[PDB]
Every structure is written in structure tokens, then in C-alpha cells.
From a paper:
The first enzyme in the pathway, peptide O-xylosyltransferase (XT, EC 2.4.2.26), catalyzes the transfer of xylose from uridine diphosphate (UDP)-α-D-xylose onto serine and thus determines the site(s) of GAG attachment on the core protein. XT1 and XT2 are type II transmembrane proteins consisting of a short amino-terminal region facing the cytosol, a single transmembrane helix, a stem region required for Golgi localization (Schön et al., 2006), a catalytic GT-A domain (Lairson et al., 2008, Müller et al., 2006), and a unique C-terminal domain of unknown function, termed “Xylo_C” in the Pfam database (Finn et al., 2008). XT1 has a two-lobed structure, with one lobe comprising the catalytic GT-A domain and the other comprising the Xylo_C domain. To better understand the initial step of GAG biosynthesis, we have determined crystal structures of human XT1 complexed with UDP-xylose and various PG-derived acceptor peptides.
Three bikunin variants bound identically to the wild-type peptide: peptide 3 (proline at position −3), peptide 5 (alanine at position +1), and peptide 7 (proline at position +3). Proline can be accommodated at positions −3 and +3, where the wild-type peptide naturally adopts a backbone conformation favorable for proline.
Numbering used by the authors:
A (entry chain A): 253 to 308, 318 to 727, 733 to 959
B (entry chain B): 211 to 219
The structure:
């Protein structure tokens, strides 16, 4: 269907061209037309504030405030959320949790909490709150309406928190502080030039949310007659102001809700703008009581370009050396961000014991961390062919360990046959060191012919191998996080159609230049290039352009300094046993496992280098790799399992229930199982003082 | 700590 208006704006044509759904293209055109006629955005807004500009703990309160916490959460880190919920809980407060529509695993875990406590509820509606999306404001405004209509919850303050927040002061001080200033609103402004704030936020640009993407559609004017302000979208607002925002029909609230429906990052300026221009303008404190770990040197890399038509930034994760910052006395602060348990748990532990004391001696699991990365109810189609293939292989690696660990000349009662697909997968950390994967899976014990449920721990073999140079480590992976300087593909799981990235980590010293060589499993040199390591460099990384598919097997990456060897590392390109979650067929196996289409991985060749580096190409191994490329079924499974076993180790395996294998422990009795005690994240009965911690 | 999450265009 053609538009109702001629569409000539460059941004809008670029948006229509990139959009994927018919509904989305229609919505884009409708929005553009309405703004074109001047019927979409307000041009002048009434200001009700009489002021000329802006306004700007060890006692026991007689009338303590009751707080409504609004948690907007996403991801997989359910156990870290449980630890934080434990720290902030008191029977007198209220907890309203909105879980991103895309995080069904997390939503199932949150549901178990809301069922235990009468002052904890979950939002029945769920939005896909993408970064910078307009829907974050819709989330807050709807939860405020819900909360104001819950008459059985007489709350006085509104506080929003994410799963990466944590308190840095006790609940008793929070209540005492807010009880003294109960008629104030806590918002932090940008603290710079206002014109530059507007440009950098894109407030003079029109955005539209559709298909989980923020489309930029053109320019717009800032309405006349009001002061525009903004800053952090983390705040604390009292009930009187929430009532005004929710139910007022005056000129200010009505037009601002329309304006901010088509705004990028709306929660960073909507509440600042309304308050300063409203009758409540004299209640504003220019302080949101937060510590945000900004390090714009690392957090501004336009890393959201695939989600929004704009460049964004985000704060860094705290580390142990930052602990002293939580003890400052310059201004009152009660929360901080960000924390990530898979990035650094020590600082979280330091902070929790400092506020609420050590755990009893002998408490297990304090230095460990478990994070679920697959749960059966979400289905194998939510996995990829890569992870499905390798999780199956890890399970088989564990079953072979069990058989070999029993020493007998009679019937081996530790022989198993695998059944179905993995039930769950966990990341396992100990002392902030990644330990590998935990796979829960079903298998038949062949001696008694009975089904058993087991969990297997697999750990990657060390492969980095290192004249006092600067190099400290080298690694290959995918999904490199430039802000946190790590691979988010923790296991380094790779398939033939993946595009690996090589990373190096350097210490201090003078500038140096090094050479990098990539070698495939049959000694073909795929790429060579030199890098400059400046004096101030700490990390370097590069993604070489390799034609796909990559030949399966064990690759090697070498670093040289003027032909002088420095170090090497290895990584695994695993052959796939699945296609569309189905057993791979001969014709699709051959297309995928015989190296890239063009006999060569890049344009320039490096055959001139094989003799120099002592990488001779064995004609027998080349033909065997071709033969391997046509195998399926059992032959292919044996090739994969021989590869995985050479790069991974089955550390241990346990049973969840009764077992006939006499040498396997119960999982709950182990130190490493996701079934073992983890009291720091476990939630029990409310104590006499109203706390869970 | 300056505030605001927007970058540029």
C-alpha cells in the first residue's frame, strides 16, 4: 500500500529500506506523514513553575517511610539478583518486578520468589525493553499506575533498580534518610552545557520504536515556553509527584507524554523536564543518591548501532580496587552500579559482608558462581546447531569417564547409553576463574536397564604456551566485549561458519611490533599480518577475513617477533552433527566440512611460508580430512568426540537421584554441582527483624 | 561523574 504522503526525507527512506516487517513499514510511514503536516509534536507548552530557574542518619524515625521498589530486569543472572533482593528486603517495603519479555528463564525464577512473599509481585504485562527504547518510559508509567491503584500497599517513595545495581548502605539508614526528606524528589542533571546535552541525546530527532529497533525518522523542534533538562534515568520520586505525573491532565503533562512517545532515551529527561516546569518544581534535589561507574574512555564505543540509529554509552563494572569509593562522605549515596558476577564477584562479596557481616564459618559456595545458559523449557530451537552439537559431546565425554572410573572384571555397572537432549547447562566460576560447563542429561544404566539423571563437569585444557617480552596472554573467540575486555562466548565454542577473533593482552613497556600467523588443521596458513603494540597498549584484537566454511579441527595461532617465536595458542572449530536441530545429512555435511568454497581462505597466498616455519603439509592428512568431510552418523560422532576429548576434560560426574554406579557421588554432596548448597543466594523465612539476610 | 547516556550522531 502506498503512503498517504510523499516521503522524501533521507532518514525515513533509509528506515523503510532496512525495515523487515510490513507492519513496521506502515507504522513508519504513518508517523512521518503526521509529523510532516505538523499534527504530531507540540510546538509550545505551558510552564506552571513560579520560580525563575531551578530549585536545588543514625536516628530512629517515629514515622518511617515505606518504599515501593520497581525492578526492571533481564538476562540469565538469576542468582545474583537473588543475592541483591536478599540485601534490600524488609517486610514493610514492596517489590514489583518487570521481567523483559525475552528472558523467559529469568521470569520462571522470579515467579518462585513472588509466590513466597506477600509483598512481592510481578508485572503481568511484559515489554521488550531494548536499550534506549521508548518502551522503558511506558514501562515506568504503567507500573506507577498499577502501584497507585494497589490500595493495600501504602508506599511513600518510588525507587527503580536493575539486576546490575547493589546497595552500599543499610536499609535502616535508607529509611531514616528518606523519612526526614519525604517531600523531596531525587534526580541528577547532566551537569554541563544544555545545548550540547540536547544534541548528544538526539532530543531534536524523531525516533519510533518498532520490531525491537529504534528508527530515526528526521528532525523536530524543541517546544517553546519550557525549560528542558535531563541526566540520569535512575531516581527516587515521592508519591505526591507520581500521582501528579500519572493523573494530571494539564497542558504540561499531556504534551510531554506525546513528545516523549517518539524520543530516544526518554527516561533520561522526561521526569526532569516535567518536574522543573510543574507546580512541584521546588521539591527537586539535584542528586539521585547513586554512584554510577562511568568510564567513558571504555564505555563509549557505539556498541548499540545494531539496535538503535544512534551511538550510546553505558557504565563499567566495579572491580575490587573500587571498594573505597563506596565509603565516600562528600554526598549521601545509597546504591551503585554496575555489578556482574561473571566478570568479578569479589567486590560484590566484599560489599555484602561490609554492610551485613560475614557468613558463619563453614558456609559453602561463598566463592563460587553458577549461571544457567540453557533450560529445557525454552526448547532446542532457542539453541544453535553449534551449542547443541557440543553440549551433546560434553555429555558423552562424562559418560565415558564414569565407565572407566570403575575397576572390575565382572559386569561394569557404570556403563550408560544417552537419551534425549540436555536438560540444562550452567557456567561454573570459582574465585573469579572460569571453570567450564555443567550439563544435566539423562541416560540409561545398562547393567540394571534403568533411566538416570546425571550432571557432568567439563573443563577446557590449557593451550596457551609461551627473552622478557610484553605479551601476557593470547586467546581466540567470538563476541568480544570492548568495554569489559573479555569474550562473552565463555567456552570459545565455534563452528565452521563462525568468524573467529584473535585477542592479545600486553603489559607495560616500550613500543613493539609483532607478527600473527593463523594455521588450519592441515597446516594451511590462512593469514599473516603485523600489529603495532604502542607503549600504552593493554589489549589488541583483530578479526581476519577468512572465506567460509572453515576447515574443522584444531587450529593454531602463533605470535612471532622478527621470526623469533614468542607464544602460541590453539582453538577448536568443531564439526557439526546437527542441521536445523536435526541429524545432519550427507549432502549438507559435505558442503560444510570440506573447507571454504574458494580453495583459499584469503586473496593473498602464504604457501611461500610453510617451509620457513616448519609446517609441512602431509598428503595423507589432507586426504583424510577430505574423507572426514563426507562422514555422517557414527563415523562423524567419533570424529567430533576425538576432537573434543583432545581439547576438553571431564572433571567429574554425579547422580541427582539413586544410582547403580557404586563410585558416583550424589550431586547435592559435591562442591561444584549446581545442586550443591549456595546459601548466599538462597531465600528462606523472614526473621523477627523483618529481613532475609 | 557526568551524567547522560547519549553519545553523538
Amino acid at each position: 500500500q502506498p503512503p498517504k504522503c510523499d516521503i522524501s526525507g533521507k532518514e525515513a527512506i533509509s528506515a523503510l529500506s532496512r525495515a523487515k516487517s510490513k507492519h513496521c513499514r506502515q507504522e513508519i510511514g504513518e508517523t512521518y506523514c503526521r509529523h510532516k503536516l505538523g499534527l504530531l509534536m507540540p510546538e509550545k507548552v505551558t510552564r506552571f513553575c513560579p520560580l525563575e530557574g531551578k530549585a536545588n542518619v543514625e536516628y530512629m524515625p517515629a514515622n518511617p517511610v515505606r518504599i515501593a521498589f520497581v525492578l526492571v530486569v533481564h538476562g540469565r543472572a538469576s542468582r545474583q539478583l537473588q543475592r541483591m533482593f536478599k540485601a534490600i528486603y524488609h517486610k514493610d517495603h514492596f517489590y514489583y518486578i518487570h521481567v523483559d519479555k525475552r528472558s523467559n528463564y529469568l521470569h520462571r525464577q522470579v515467579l518462585q520468589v513472588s509466590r513466597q512473599y506477600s509483598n512481592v509481585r510481578v508485572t503481568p504485562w511484559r515489554m521488550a525493553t531494548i536499550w534506549g527504547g521508548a518502551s522503558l518510559l511506558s514501562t515506568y508509567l504503567q507500573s506507577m499506575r498499577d502501584l497507585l491503584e494497589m490500595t493495600d500497599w501504602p508506599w511513600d517513595f518510588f525507587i527503580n533498580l536493575s539486576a546490575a545495581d547493589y546497595p552500599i548502605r543499610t536499609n535502616d539508614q535508607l529509611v531514616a534518610f528518606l523519612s526526614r526528606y519525604r517531600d523531596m524528589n531525587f534526580l541528577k542533571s547532566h551537569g554541563r552545557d544544555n545545548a550540547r546535552f540536547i544534541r548528544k541525546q538526539g532530543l531534536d530527532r524523531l525516533f519510533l520504536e518498532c520490531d525491537a529497533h529504534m528508527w530515526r525518522l528526521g528532525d523536530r523542534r524543541i517546544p517553546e515556553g519550557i525549560a528542558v533538562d535531563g541526566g540520569s534515568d535512575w531516581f527516587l520520586l515521592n508519591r505526591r509527584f507520581v500521582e501528579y505525573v500519572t493523573f494530571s491532565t494539564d497542558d504540561l503533562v499531556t504534551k510531554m507524554k506525546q513528545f516523549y512517545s517518539y524520543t530516544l532515551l526518554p527516561a533520561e529527561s522526561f521526569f526532569h523536564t516535567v518536574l522543573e516546569n510543574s507546580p512541584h518544581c521546588d521539591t527537586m534535589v539535584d542528586n539521585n543518591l547513586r554512584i554510577t561507574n562511568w568510564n567513558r574512555k571504555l564505555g563509549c564505543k557505539c556498541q548499540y548501532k545494531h539496535i538503535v540509529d544512534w551511538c550510546g554509552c553505558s557504565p563499567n563494572d566495579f572491580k575490587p580496587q573500587d571498594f573505597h569509593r563506596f565509603q565516600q562522605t562528600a554526598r549521601p549515596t545509597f546504591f551503585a552500579r554496575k555489578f556482574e558476577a561473571v566478570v568479578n564477584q569479589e567486590i560484590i562479596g566484599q560489599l555484602d559482608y561490609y554492610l551485613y557481616g560475614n557468613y558463619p564459618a563453614g558456609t559453602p559456595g561463598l566463592r563460587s558462581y553458577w549461571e544457567n545458559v540453557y533450560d529445557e523449557p525454552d526448547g532446542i530451537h532457542s539453541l544453535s546447531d553449534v551449542t547443541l552439537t557440543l553440549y551433546h559431546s560434553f555429555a558423552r565425554l562424562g559418560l565415558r569417564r564414569a565407565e572407566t572410573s570403575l575397576h572390575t572384571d565382572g559386569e561394569n555397572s557404570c556403563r550408560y547409553y544417552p537419551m534425549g537432549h540436555p536438560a540444562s547447562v550452567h557456567l561454573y566460576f570459582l574465585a573469579d576463574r572460569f571453570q567450564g560447563f555443567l550439563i544435566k542429561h539423562h541416560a540409561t544404566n545398562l547393567a540394571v536397564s534403568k533411566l538416570e539423571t546425571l550432571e557432568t563437569w567439563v573443563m577446557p585444557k590449557k593451550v596457551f604456551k609461551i627473552d622478557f617480552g610484553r605479551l601476557q596472554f593470547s586467546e581466540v573467540g567470538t563476541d568480544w566485549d570492548a568495554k569489559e575486555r573479555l569474550f562473552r562466548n565463555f567456552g570459545g565454542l565455534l563452528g565452521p561458519m563462525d568468524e573467529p577473533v584473535g585477542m592479545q593482552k600486553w603489559g607495560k613497556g616500550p613500543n613493539v611490533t609483532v607478527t600473527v600467523i593463523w594455521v588450519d588443521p592441515v597446516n594451511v596458513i590462512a593469514a599473516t599480518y603485523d600489529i603495532l603494540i604502542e607503549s600504552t597498549a593493554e589489549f589488541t584484537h583483530y578479526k581476519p577475513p577468512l572465506n567460509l566454511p572453515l576447515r574443522p579441527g584444531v587450529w593454531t595461532v602463533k605470535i612471532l617477533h622478527h621470526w623469533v617465536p614468542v607464544a602460541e595458542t590453539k582453538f577448536l572449530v568443531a564439526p557439526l552433527t546437527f542441521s536445523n536441530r536435526q541429524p545432519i545429512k550427507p549432502e549438507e555435511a559435505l558442503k560444510l566440512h570440506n573447507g571454504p568454497l574458494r580453495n583459499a581462505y584469503m586473496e593473498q597466498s602464504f604457501q611461500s611460508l610453510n617451509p620457513v616455519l616448519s609446517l609441512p603439509i602431509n598428503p595423507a592428512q589432507v586426504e583424510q580430512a577430505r574423507r572426514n568431510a563426507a562422514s555422517t552418523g557414527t563415523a562423524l560422532e567419533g570424529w567430533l568426540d576425538s576432537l573434543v576429548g583432545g581439547m576438553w576434560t571431564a572433571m567429574d560426574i554425579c547422580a541427582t537421584g539413586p544410582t547403580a554406579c557404586p563410585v558416583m557421588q550424589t550431586c547435592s554432596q559435591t562442591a561444584w554441582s549446581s545442586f550443591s548448597p549456595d546459601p548466599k543466594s538462597e531465600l528462606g523465612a523472614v526473621k523477627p527483624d523483618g529481613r532475609l539476610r | 561523574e557526568e551524567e547522560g547516556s547519549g553519545g553523538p550522531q
